[PDB]
Symmetry: D2
Subunit: 114 residues, 4 copies
């Protein structure tokens, strides 16, 4: 699929499982419209968010509900969520990886050619 999300937990050294993830596309009036969502699997992965036909060029936001995830582990977190905003440009499979800690997160993009 053209867009995949992979989330890891830096405290336990494991995939971040059952993390809610919502994806939005920016519309003509500059608001975010829901596009896709899911929960990460047992391997911290979220596949089948979209298809090639639907994933057109545009500005996308991937919002990862980190706060609910830490709350379920009984750990006080800093961030309300993690939000990754990017332009999808035709020329390409996107993997958005995120590494979570209660007071920090990192995100990287892996952009590859089939």
């Amino acid at each position: 699929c053209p867009l995949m999300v992979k989330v890891l937990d830096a405290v336990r050294g494991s995939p971040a499982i059952n993390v809610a993830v919502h994806v939005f596309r920016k519309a003509a009036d500059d608001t975010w419209e829901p596009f896709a969502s899911g929960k990460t699997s047992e391997s911290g992965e979220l596949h089948g968010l979209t298809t090639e036909e639907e994933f057109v060029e545009g500005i996308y936001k991937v919002e990862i509900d980190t706060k609910s995830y830490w709350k379920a582990l009984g750990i006080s977190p800093f961030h309300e969520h993690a939000e990754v905003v990017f332009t999808a440009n035709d020329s390409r499979r996107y993997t958005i990886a995120a590494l979570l800690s209660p007071y920090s997160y990192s995100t990287t993009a892996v952009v590859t050619n089939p």
Copy 2:
């Protein structure tokens, strides 16, 4: 000061200089209200965004304009910005440092929260 932002460049091993930073606060009607903004200095620091009086409890969004930064350097980066969103001062006033590390296709953000 109660809120400070520090930005580094992981390609150039230097502070990220002249990076625009915009801070918003969630209003009663659930919309983002403009709160303060500024530019990182030669040391990659942004001080003086706010005051103890003005920086009340709330949900804040710190948006770091990573894209314009990379573009001025001739790089086409992945992200539009780096965005940090947090509830501030929920148990009384704290001092927040938002530290960000930038690469063209990655960023990290961390918070240092201390009680004066």
Copy 3:
């Protein structure tokens, strides 16, 4: 396999391909002895480093030749290499992930139960 290495490139947004990786186990006299090595694949992965029988408890070092990798891209790097040192403890597949930038690197461990 019990030990896997995955390396990403934060400058290009891609797997880090053809990165030399050497693994060492700490011996009784506190020196590092070569244990395994390889180069990352087209997907930035290095599999088949060791087997369950051979990967006993001990202190391991994973040395990732980041400097040669940046040099091949024509980019000046800071670090001589990236070196991840850990205790492998029985109770477990280890993924060591690393995210590379010329002046920074991060590494995380994903430790999972088959």
Copy 4:
């Protein structure tokens, strides 16, 4: 001072305090010679490790004792330490800040290199 180390804790959103740091320099015979060592302060900073005179060209290793840090907090971390290895002063004297961010199963390290 020419070499400074700054350490943060990503679990506690605070400086990493009382972290041991050992610095070595590669000798002529290719072995690591002890160069300087110290403990991070209440701000997670380690200053005064060396001087401009003493900090000559060479390959240096900065070893941050992350394991003892986590253990004193009751965590069993993954890594034995965080180790940064770099050629220093190859085009003349520079000032180096080694910044590290710590989680039990992860760490990041970055370098800020400036020309006084």
